[PDB]
Amino acid sequence: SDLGKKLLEAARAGQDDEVRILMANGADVNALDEVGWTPLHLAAWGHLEIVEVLLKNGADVNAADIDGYTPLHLAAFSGHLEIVEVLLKYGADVNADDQAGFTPLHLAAIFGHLEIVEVLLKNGADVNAQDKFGKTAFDISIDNGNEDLAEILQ
Amino acid sequence: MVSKGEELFTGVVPILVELDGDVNGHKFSVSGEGEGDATYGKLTLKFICTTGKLPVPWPTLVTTLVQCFSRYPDHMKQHDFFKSAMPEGYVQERTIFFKDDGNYKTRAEVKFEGDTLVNRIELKGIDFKEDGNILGHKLEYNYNSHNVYIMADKQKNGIKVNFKIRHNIEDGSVQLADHYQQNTPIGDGPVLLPDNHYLSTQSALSKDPNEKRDHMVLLEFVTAAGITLGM
């Protein structure tokens, strides 16, 4: 699978049309690198048009990396609302944890991304889920003194 | 009114590392020498235990033994905290939790002394099992690629760094080492506080065929990524 390595690199590099070419010529949409990242993990950091192309071509929306992180985790960590939205549209697990130690809601709360918090809640995020430190998203907003968020979360 | 520390890394920079260690009362000292080239994210170092046999596996010390040599792409240069603290340097604090075993606490100063980038560390390990994977030397002599997650800590004028290391056990499974890290500038000058991003790491461990002391030869490549604005 050498086209798959090329696809991982094209996704990392943000080369929208190279991703299109590689997949039309047979590249494995779910190619894996050494840290368990697929092209969709790489694109979750801000490459919206590549996210969309990958999902349309069968990318595993819920693939977990070696640390347990799904693309939705990475999009919440890096603050990309439109990517969060398209991932959820394509069936991303809004409450994925399974060794990550955080749900996407926790990550959005940690970094004060109120719009992402609201989208996650609308898609069924569990406000009572506790992260690996025992904290809910509400607790996180209290610890950060974010009363705009504490408000939204009650 | 902005730091110029990145200009100290345009070429090859010599490195010295000095580690004073104590794990469960087992004391040791490690010295490293080599060089770094941030333009390719490249580190070339050799480490020697100068006090005898190393009482823990070499792989468990790799993260403790200079992230200013990470390659930050041109479009991410405003997110490189490590170089922006130079030459005065930064303090690097960690706790490393070995799952079902003990923990390392480490405190280091990373700074220029002359033309040389120097990493000076104190390490304290407690609560290890003498028959566990660490004091029992059950870890493979190799190293995996990892993702290192970097976040601004504005209240400390620095960064928070979190990641998990997986040490292959010589049998089957993996020993988790959970890293909690904090970096703060030593000087009073301006620093760069980054947006959230990650480093992609890759490390190769080997031996020097002519070295009779306990030692580790290390070749490492690290590139920052995850900020797509301006690519």
Author numbering:
A (entry chain A): 12 to 165
B (entry chain B): 0 to 64, 68 to 233
Mind quoting what the paper says about this structure?
All hydrogen bonds except two (GFP-residue Gln204 to Asp143 and His114 of eGFP) are also found in the complex structures of the parental DARPins with eGFP. The structures of the GFP-clamps confirm the intended design: both DARPin-derived domains overlay well with the parental DARPins when superimposed on eGFP. Most interactions between the DARPins and eGFP are found in the single DARPin complexes as well as in the GFP-clamp complexes, confirming that both domains can bind their respective epitope without strain or steric hindrance.
